[PDB]
Amino acid sequence: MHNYVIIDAFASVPLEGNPVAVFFDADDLPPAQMQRIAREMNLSESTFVLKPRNGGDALIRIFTPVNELPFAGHPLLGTAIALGAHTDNHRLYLETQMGTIAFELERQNGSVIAASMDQPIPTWTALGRDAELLKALGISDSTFPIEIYHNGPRHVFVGLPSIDALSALHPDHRALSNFHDMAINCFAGAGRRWRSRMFSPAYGVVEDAATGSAAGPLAIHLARHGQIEFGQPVEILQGVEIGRPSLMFAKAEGRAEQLTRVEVSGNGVTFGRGTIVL
Amino acid sequence: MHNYVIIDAFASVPLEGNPVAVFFDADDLPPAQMQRIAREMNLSESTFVLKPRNGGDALIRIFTPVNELPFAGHPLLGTAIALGAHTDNHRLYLETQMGTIAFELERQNGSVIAASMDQPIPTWTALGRDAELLKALGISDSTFPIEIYHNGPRHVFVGLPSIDALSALHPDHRALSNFHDMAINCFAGAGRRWRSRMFSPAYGVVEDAATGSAAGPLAIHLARHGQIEFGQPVEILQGVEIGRPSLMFAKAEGRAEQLTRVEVSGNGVTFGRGTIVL
Secondary structure, eight states, X not given: OEEEEEEEETOSSTTSSEEEEEESSOTTSOHHHHHHHHHHHOSSOEEEEEOOSXXXXXXXXXXXXXXXXXXXXXXHHHHHHHHGGGOOOSEEXXXXXXXXXXXXXXXXXXXXXXXXXXXXXXXXXXXXXXHHHHHHXXXXXXXSOOEEEXXXXXXXXXXXXXXXXXXXXXXXXXXXXXSOSXXXXXXXXXXXXXXXXXXXTTTTEEEESXXXXXXXXXXXXXXXXXXXXXXXXXXXXXXXXXXXXXXXXXXXXXXXXXXXXXXXXXXXXXXXXXXXXX | OEEEEEEEEXXXXXXXXEEEEEXXXXXXXXXXXXXXXXXXXXXXXXXXXXXXSSSSSEEEEEEOSSOEESOOHHHHHHHXXXXXXXXXXXXXXXXXXXXEEEEEEEEETTEEEEEEEEOOOOEEEEOSOHHHHHHHHTOSOOSSOOEEEESSSEEEEEEOSSHHHHHTOOOOHHHHTTSOSOEEEEEEEETTEEEEEEEEXXXXXXXXXXXXXXXXXXXXXXXXXXXXXXXXXXXXXXXXXXXXXXXXXXXXXXXXXXXXXXXXXXXEEEEEEEEEOO
């Protein structure tokens, strides 16, 4: 009854990046059933491709094993790459709970290998729990201001003075569980090239492979704090320490006070394909 | 490159019971790759069907997303039901790290709908942390002695005076995380019919749908404590509260001091089928 594909998002090699299951022709599935299927698959998200209701190409609903999400970066990227297999269009308009997200698809010989999305514009403020967070992470201080960004999920950024220092982190995950409804993103790098690790008890992941919705906020954080310019693309490599390398590209256009576009792009690859019995 | 099926073990209806992914013809996969695939699928277990090395029908390796397991009940039951689709034999001998487990397959029109296994004979002793465990569970006392059983995994049993009391449990999962390398199985019932809930921070599950390896130990616990006889089959219904009903049948033959057979059986159903790219 339903076809699905498993896409590793932010990777070009299977078993790298972050998997999402994408279910096609889902209009006959009530959302209670979509939630049960997402629970059954147990991937960080499963998405469901529905007929559009506002002039887009398709309406996408995104579910973790436990709840529906209004926005998620890696699941949406994977969905666009999956759906790109059944269309010839250059651009793909995906309706979500939060509006229609424009995707540019990149192909080779009819195969979609990558896509770029324009993300919701985040907001941000100081976290204001620095000593607590630093203690939990096991370090004394951040490099750049510890700020928390909101674009659906919330992501806090803590900067490390080198990639080695980033890899040496061994956080107190019990201590981190006191930070509700957010993910902790630790980063290090220079110039165009940055490394990240994400930890989130609130979002049910000890350490995440590819935090798509943190990539845009990171490019903003770096530009605001003078490490790159607004409009300069950055490469963010995540998940190396846990053996799930994920490459996210991001760019924040405009200025802090008036952001014009937050672009995030990356590769996607098919890990598997199947059908389910309902 | 590899075919797989998703079997809901201890269920006859898709989305009930406990899913396992079973990968066929896995001899060309090194165990490091099997572990990576199990991580990718993220189901409580994935299993891999290999050529036998000691006169069995097949050698099965069982992986959680994080490690290999020497024995697991629901994954093995699901594997036997999956593999039963590619043989006509009445009995199926599955080699595992811990020896060859004999499965009787039950068919209708060539479809395997159920199977029975003879489990490893458990051992047991008092847990000796009663007040700590009871506090964590949020109740004052158990009905029957709080004993911990070992058959690979470890399972502790805490008895409740009614099914309603079992459903009313709201455990302190942080407090439960102090119980390492075990699962906490709470039960209630009468006669042939029992209800269970399982919680296990050590094994990475907040509440489990079908704890196959606890079913045999529960039948022993009940017979030792005079609620059923040795040799009497019990029906154990798990996972009702979390909307994943799982029906496990168990029987412990012999006597406490000399157990002859610990039989656990149940239904299995295919939820999905697919192929992966490596």
